Amino acid sequence: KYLKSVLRELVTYLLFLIVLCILTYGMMSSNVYYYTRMMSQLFLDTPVSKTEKTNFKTLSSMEDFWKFTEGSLLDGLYWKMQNRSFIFYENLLLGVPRIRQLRVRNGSCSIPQDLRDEIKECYDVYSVSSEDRAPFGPRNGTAWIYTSEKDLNGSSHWGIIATYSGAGYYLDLSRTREETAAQVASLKKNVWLDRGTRATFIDFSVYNANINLFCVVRLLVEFPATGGVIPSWQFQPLKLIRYVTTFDFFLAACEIIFCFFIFYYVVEEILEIRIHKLHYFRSFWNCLDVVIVVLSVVAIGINIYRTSNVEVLLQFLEDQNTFPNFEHLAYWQIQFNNIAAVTVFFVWIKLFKFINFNRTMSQLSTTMSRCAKDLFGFAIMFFIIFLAYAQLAYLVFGTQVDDFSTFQECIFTQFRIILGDINFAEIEEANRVLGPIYFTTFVFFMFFILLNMFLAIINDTYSEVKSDLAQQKAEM
Amino acid sequence: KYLKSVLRELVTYLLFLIVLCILTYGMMSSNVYYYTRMMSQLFLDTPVSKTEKTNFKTLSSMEDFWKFTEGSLLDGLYWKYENLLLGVPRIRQLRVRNGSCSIPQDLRDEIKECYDVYSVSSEDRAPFGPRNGTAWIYTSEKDLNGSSHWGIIATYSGAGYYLDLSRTREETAAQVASLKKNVWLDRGTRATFIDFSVYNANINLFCVVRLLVEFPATGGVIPSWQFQPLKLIRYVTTFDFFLAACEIIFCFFIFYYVVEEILEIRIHKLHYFRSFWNCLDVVIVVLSVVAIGINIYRTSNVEVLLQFLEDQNTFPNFEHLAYWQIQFNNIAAVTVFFVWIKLFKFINFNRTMSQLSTTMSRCAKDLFGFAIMFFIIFLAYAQLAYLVFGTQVDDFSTFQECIFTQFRIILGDINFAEIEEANRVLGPIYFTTFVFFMFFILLNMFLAIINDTYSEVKSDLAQQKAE
Amino acid sequence: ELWPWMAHVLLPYVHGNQSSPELGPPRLRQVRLQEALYPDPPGPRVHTC
Amino acid sequence: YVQELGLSLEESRDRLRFLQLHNWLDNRSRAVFLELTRYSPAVGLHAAV
Ligand SMILES: *[C@@H]1O[C@H](CO)[C@@H](O)[C@H](O)[C@H]1NC(C)=O
Ligand SMILES: *[C@@H]1O[C@H](CO)[C@@H](O)[C@H](O)[C@H]1NC(C)=O
Ligand SMILES: *[C@@H]1O[C@H](CO)[C@@H](O)[C@H](O)[C@H]1NC(C)=O
Ligand SMILES: *[C@@H]1O[C@H](CO)[C@@H](O)[C@H](O)[C@H]1NC(C)=O
Ligand SMILES: *[C@@H]1O[C@H](CO)[C@@H](O)[C@H](O)[C@H]1NC(C)=O
């Protein structure tokens, strides 16, 4: 046999690949790019005021933030129509933007008594157990009163320094600039960004009715306890009103067919595991199917969890003078994309099983497979030295370089050096004794010696495989 | 018998190659670069206004365009580089119509109109504004010699609302002010073309210039430009007589080659498309025939511009000439490449060269069979990067952009300042797993094949020589 | 310009309302050599000091 | 040769100008060596500047 059985097993895979490709082409269009590009350039690439050149992307002080919040921010939220506020005369600013603050309390840490004459207070780094909850300043509104995480429908964020909660002191802004500017001025006069503040969030969203794509915008600013400002941004093109055009029904039908295909595969895998050979995991061709089906079922579960959860849109459509809460939907969309992008990768990778249709491809596959059993040991022995260099660099230079400021950053820096991108022109300033020594040793031992065993093993394996397959003709 | 025929073939090929090399090199004059560079620096670098710096290259709003059409454009066109105008410039507009969606019923009360992305089925053929003339009435594509353009976002049609300006500054300024006073650049606009041509009598070189401004359905402005210089006299001195003689002898050479090929294929019914040195000769012949046809087509109608130096008052339609010039260049530049490559059959007369030739001819099958397994993984990574980074980096926006970015990464030109911040997880994973599977594994396999085959072929050839 | 630099950016950094508690006054230890130098010919520096 | 650079802003600035005009740093004066301190109670780390 081996032919009349594989032909069905091949066409069933080809149809699966076609459906997956249709889905991938469907979700990713070419209109999201320019949408997000203009949306980002409107807020990030514009100076706070015409008399300086410090944009939100390069904030450096607590004072610059106030210049930003009344400035390039208000100028890019409210556009006078030739009341509603269309950003680019196409994008609709639905709802109102909301600002929020996360801060810690006075006396959150301890100082020694021998120098407790000059140090009058300390503000410890942000922690859920050290977060202030008392009302400060003038106790008028929601901007000076703590609010629990469940009363804001919020969640965690996982910023750059730490993972911030969903609570804090929040404030909703108006619809016209005339009142939003007054509110911001009121916040700035009665000092609101004190020394105790640790994080600030700004959130809003737009519609852009021409195409059907919501865009949710979040801006984070972090204040480390050691001083400084760290900005971050996130623009997400969500889509929530899918069924309008025929292509949408086409995509839904392809999704249904995809679910049917994955159900078929899981059934034929359970049948094979139970009604046939047990513990068939020494193949790498069946350990790939389980990964694909698990990733697919996780993606389907996430889609069912998220798509069926859209009542927040209905609540916003009831009254459209309140802040819409679309933060969870963007997070789940990001998670769904991160899963689909890996699923399609493995689906494409699986195609290698189907290419043995002549001598050359078969022998290349044999060489590639036989060369994996022994490359594994050298890969481990090489990665051990790689991590040794990584930890050495992290311990030595990981305090002044900022390219080695984190372990994974050290790994990426080493890989970039391997590609030939990073030069040590700053390492001497970082260190003059152990800098050039480390650089020379790394670029000599792991680029002239260690990196050639990979070539040697492959070269020898291919040579012996070809010689064996040629000798396989002296017997026949 | 072998040497005689081989040397005859070699000498004929050398004459063909030298004729082609002279013919192509005589078509490149160094002033074309200077002309295009100065034209671009004049129409695209000068500030829109004295107090502003937003040149045409950095347009950012539908209002800056209205300043450009009254600022740098008029100054550059109606100058004090020392060129003169011919004919009259034309400005054309492409719009879409209101009501092109099925608006969701939920929020249909808030919004009231779509201006959908540009398409043939959604074009606005109805009149609008004051129904004065051509500037407010739809004109069919056939009525006006038009053709597609293939802009950055989409391919546009040849129809639209057109208007022809005047010759001097005052009337064109008045017409532009009249267009600005009314709403001509409405919210429904999707494309704006400005077209004209100049002569620059100082050095004989026509120039056809086309500027395009695109308004995507999500706001913003996308500018693009195209400057095409032309030389269409070609009979001025002895040099171009030499060029014409070279042209005619080239035609004779290609005639001889095609008749030889047709006789040869008459002899061998099939099995003739496997030597791979005939499959390339036929490609060269076909490319040369296409090039000569294009040259005949674009030299048949050249007289039409002659009655434009007499200072007429109309629009000179010069898109076809520029397009066919570009096409003819893009064909010459490939037939030259292939005729140069074909030369790899007359340098096997040595010993080392013969070994290299038989090496490359003996390891072509493995290289081609492995370029499939390499490109499958390459495309898998391309699709992964497109799905993850295809919205915010700007280096993975389109699909082919991902492939080109990966090829640049192979040359060691990674940025990594945006890959790591666009997706903190699954981005660095992609970057690290891409370098380990390319520089360590998949680029050490080509060398292994080329390292084994060379040794094998040298051993066999040395044994045969010593046999 | 060292004096304007210190008077403009450093002194406001050391003192102030709260302004980054210091734990210690500054110092200006300084060496003289006693072997009076002469300016080099025009040009910043030829090889080294 | 050291300088304490005062305690508060006004006296320190006045003494700085006083030593500036009296030619404290215009002669040979190989180095200057300004270095004071830093300490962050929130994290519990000192810094030599
Ligand atoms: C912070 O607390 C300290 C002591 O814990 C005390 O001086 C006061 O309550 C706060 N500091 C200031 C400057 O108000
Ligand atoms: C706070 O409330 C008081 C009295 O209720 C009012 O006078 C004041 O304007 C409010 N806003 C402030 C202090 O920012
Ligand atoms: C949070 O969710 C509740 C649930 O209905 C909603 O009423 C409320 O408006 C939301 N927002 C806040 C700030 O409570
Ligand atoms: C676009 O069409 C809608 C359809 O009802 C209409 O209400 C709206 O007024 C139109 N736009 C303009 C600018 O008239
Ligand atoms: C349109 O009307 C006539 C021709 O139809 C013309 O004289 C006039 O100047 C044009 N413009 C306006 C604003 O009427």
DSSP per-residue codes, D1-49: ------SSHHHHHHHHHHHHHTTSSSSS----------EETTTTEE---
Tokens of B443: 């680029």
The torsion angles phi and psi of A80, rounded to 5 degrees, stand at -70, 120
Q: Of chain D residues 12-41, which have a CB less than 8 A from chain A?
A: 40-41
Structure tokens at B90: 């034309």
Residue at A72: amino acid letter: S
Burial pattern D6-39, b for ≥16 Cβ within 10 A else e, equals: beeeeebbeebeeeeeeeeeeeeeeeeebebbeb
CB of A183 within 6 A of ligand 2: the answer is: no
Residue with tokens 């670098």: B45
Contact A446, A385 (CB under 8 A): yes
Mind telling me how many Å the CA of A341 is from chain B's nearest CA? 5
The angle formed by the CA atoms of residues B192, B197 and B199, to the nearest 5 degrees, is 165
**Closest by Cα among B66, B71, B89 to B186:** B66
Sorted by sequence, the CB contacts under 8 Å of residue B299 that are 6+ apart come out as none
The reply to whether residue D42 touches residue A111, judged by beta carbons under 8 angstroms, is no
CA distances for A92 relative to A81, A88, A211, A212, angstroms = 12, 8, 12, 12
Name the token pair of A362: 């078969």
Q: Quick one: B95 exposed, middle or buried, by C-beta within 10 A (0-12, 13-18, 19+)?
A: buried
Question: Please, what is the end-to-end C-alpha distance for chain D in angstroms?
Answer: 19
Q: Tell if the CB–CB gap between C33 and D25 is shorter than 8 Å.
A: no
CA of A152 to the centre of ligand 3 (A): 6
Q: Find out whether B364 and B358 touch, Cβ atoms under 8 Å.
A: no
CB-CB contact of A98 with D15 (8 Å): no
Bridge partners of B40, per DSSP, are: none
Environment class of A462 (CB within 10 Å of its CB; exposed 0-12, middle 13-18, buried 19+): buried
In angstroms, the CA B251 to CA B295 distance is 12
Token digits of residue C36: 């009076």
Residue A150 corresponds to which amino acid? K
B376, A411: Cβ pair inside 8 Å?
no
Element (H, E) at B152: none
For residue A207, which of A177, A180, A240, A247 has the smallest C-alpha distance? A240
Helix (H, G, I), strand (E, B) or coil at A77: coil
Nearest-angstrom CA–CA distance, B396 and B401: 5
Q: Binding site for cholesterol, residues of B?
A: 327
Which two three-digit tokens encode residue A176?
Answer: 């016209």
**Which of D14, D32, D45 to mutate against chain C (most C CBs within 10 Å)?**
D32
| Residues of chain C with C-beta less than 8 angstroms from the C-beta of A195 | 18
Side-chain-side CA neighbours of residue A353 (13 Å)? 17
The B189-198 sheet, strands edge to edge: B161-164, B90-95, B189-198, B206-214, B222-230
How near does any CA of chain A get to the CA of B429, in Å?
A: 10
Q: Report the C-alpha gap between A109 and A122 in whole angstroms.
A: 6
Rg, C-alpha atoms of chain C: 18
Q: Which of B452, B439, B449 is nearest to A364 (CA)?
A: B449
Q: Which long-range contacts (CB under 8 A, 24 or more apart) does B244-252 make?
A: B246/B19, B246/B22, B246/B23, B246/B26, B247/B23, B249/B19, B250/B16, B250/B19, B250/B20, B250/B23, B251/B292
The backbone torsions φ and ψ at residue A231, rounded to the nearest 5 degrees and listed phi first, read -95, 155
For the CA atoms of chain A, what is the radius of gyration? 29
Pairing of β A169-172 and β A98-103: antiparallel
The whole-angstrom separation of Cα B420 and Cα B55 is: 33
* Ligand 4 near B98 CB (within 6 A): yes
| 3-state secondary structure at position A47 | strand
Beta bridge partner(s), residue A92: A86
Do the Cβ atoms of A170 and A98 come closer than 8 Å? yes
- The count of other CB atoms within 10 Å of the CB of residue A321 is 10
Residue A90's Cβ-count burial label (10 Å; 0-12, 13-18, 19+) is buried
Label residue A362 exposed, middle or buried (CB < 10 Å: 0-12, 13-18, 19+). Answer: middle
- List strand residue ranges (DSSP E) for A124-167, in order: none
**What is the A136 CA–ligand 2 centroid distance (Å)?**
14
Shortest distance, CA B177 to any CA of chain A (angstroms): 19
What Å distances lie between residue B257 and A104, A310, A415, B262, B288, CA to CA?
86, 71, 54, 9, 11
What is the rounded CA–CA span in Å between residue B425 and residue A341? 13
Considering only CA atoms, which of A346, A285, A472, A362 is closest in space to residue B369?
Answer: A362
Integer Rg of chain B from CA = 29
Q: Please identify which residue in the block is written with the tokens 């005339």.
A: A178
Please give the residue of chain A at the shortest CA–CA distance from D47.
A226
Token pair in block for residue B29: 């004059």
Q: What residue type is assigned to position B378 of the chain? A: F
Q: Whose CA is nearest to atom 5 of ligand 2?
A: A140
Ligand 4 centre distance from Cα of residue A367 (Å): 68
Query: Tell me, what DSSP letter sits at residue A167?
Result: -
CA A191 to chain centre: 35
Ligand 5 pocket (Cβ < 6 Å) reads B 130, 132
- Give how far Cα A473 sits from Cα of A361, A467, A468, A469, Å: 18, 10, 9, 7
Interface test with B, best of A23, A31, A34 (most B CBs within 10 A): A34
Contact predicate A415/B435, CB 8 Å? yes
| 3-state SS record for A201-252 | EEEEEECCCCCCCEEEEEEEEECCCCCCCEEEEEEEEECCCCCCCHHHHHHH
Entry resolution (Å): 3.4
The experimental method is: cryo-EM
Q: What single-letter DSSP state applies at residue B390?
A: T
CA distance B42 to B57: 12
Q: Which atom of ligand 2 is nearest to the CA of A186?
A: 14
Q: Does C38 touch chain D (CB under 8 A)?
A: no
Query: Whose CA is closest to A57, among A213, A232, A208?
Result: A232
Please report where in the chains the tokens 């040099």 appear, as a residue: B239
Cα–Cα distance, B126 to B135 (Å, whole number)? 12
What lies within 8 Å, CB to CB, of B218 at 6+ separation is A31, A34, A35, A38, A88, A90, A91, A208, A210, A211
Q: How far is CA A217 from CA A64, A213, D30, in A?
A: 20, 13, 56
The count of residues in chain C is 49
For B400, list phi and psi in degrees, rounded to 5: -65, -25
Contact A125 D41 (CB under 8 A): no
Instruction: Provide the H-helix boundaries in B426-466.
Output: 428-436, 444-466
Distance from CA of A67 to the nearest CA of B (A): 24
Interface probe with D: pick from A104, A113, A122, most Cβ of D within 10 Å:
A122
Residue A246, token pair as written in the block: 């025929």
For the record, the structure tokens of B42 come out as 């004049």
In B113-237, which residue ranges form alpha helices assigned H by DSSP?
169-181
Q: DSSP characters for B310-329? A: TT-SS----HHHHHHHHHHH
Distance CA A391, CA A381 (A): 16
Largest CA distance in chain A: 96
Q: For the packed helices B444-466 and A450-475, what is the interaxial angle rounded to 10 degrees? A: 50
Cα distances from C11 to residues A62, B133, D46, in angstroms, run 20, 73, 20
Contacts of C29 in chain D (CB under 8 A): 1-2, 33
Cα–Cα–Cα angle for A365, A371, A374, nearest 5°?
155
Six token digits for residue B96: 């879409």
Neighboring chain A residues of C21 at a CB cutoff of 8 Å: 118-119
What 3-state class would DSSP assign to A131? strand
- The DSSP result for B43-83, as a single string, is HHSS-SSSS----GGG--SHHHHHHHTTTHHHHHHT-----
Look at residue A303 and give its three-state secondary structure. helix
